Design a binder for this molecule. Sequence first.
Ligand SMILES: *[C@@H]1C(=O)N[C@@](O)(CC/C=C\C/C=C/C)[C@H]1O
Length: 266
Amino acid sequence: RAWRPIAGGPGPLVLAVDFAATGRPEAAFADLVARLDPGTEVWESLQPPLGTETGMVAEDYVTRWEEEVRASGRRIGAVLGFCAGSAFAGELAVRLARSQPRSPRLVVFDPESPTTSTLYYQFRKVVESLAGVLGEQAAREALAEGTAAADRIGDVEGLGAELVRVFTAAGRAACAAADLDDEFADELTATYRSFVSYLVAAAAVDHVKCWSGAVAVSSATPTSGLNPLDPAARAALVERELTFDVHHADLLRDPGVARAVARLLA
Ligand SMILES: *[C@@H]1C(=O)N[C@@](O)(CC/C=C\C/C=C/C)[C@H]1O
């Protein structure tokens, strides 16, 4: 299955696209849907079973999500995405505008098309967050190799593949230097692999095309979402941009965000 219901309803459906990962710093769509209008039915995107995302490009990710919606027979009233998930949200919304008589609304939250920079920064934060499970040695070497990779590999797909190599090697080193359990380590390295696969495929989406009709919801974190862009570039990229004085990591749990989103969906 490619979708998980996270809030019930009678009615048109809301899809929410994100990489589900307990332990990340950022609030999640569960935090937003808790604060939306009751009766809003919401499904959250599931990743392919661990390992089966090997061999999937962006087209395959989107078709997998889209075919399950087609099979369900349900109509989609809105597609939400957060961060890199906004890329896939936009593509699904464009495809549903073509397959449905009436187009869904598209709302993207701090939308990002992954770059070598965002990939590398997220890699560093994953490693730091897991320094205790990996041990100081495997974590130190992972950062050293990842920095070297970021210095030498200029493209997103290639950097992602190398960072996954590095992280996999760190997990395997932790099982033989820091006493990390072997099945927890396979899960850890497989989950990071799935995350990078998702990010690299998200980067392949034509985000200029698919965000042209999006309403963007923006935090105040200057490195997040549309915030690094020139003002004229932001206005050209999306149809509308609402701003909120909250951190990126709090955006989806903020009551003001939820109030505005409920009105966008009404
Ligand atoms: C951008 C995105 O696509 N997901 C994020 O929540 C980042 C998740 C990245 C890393 C988890 C790092 C944990 C220490 C959003 O920022």
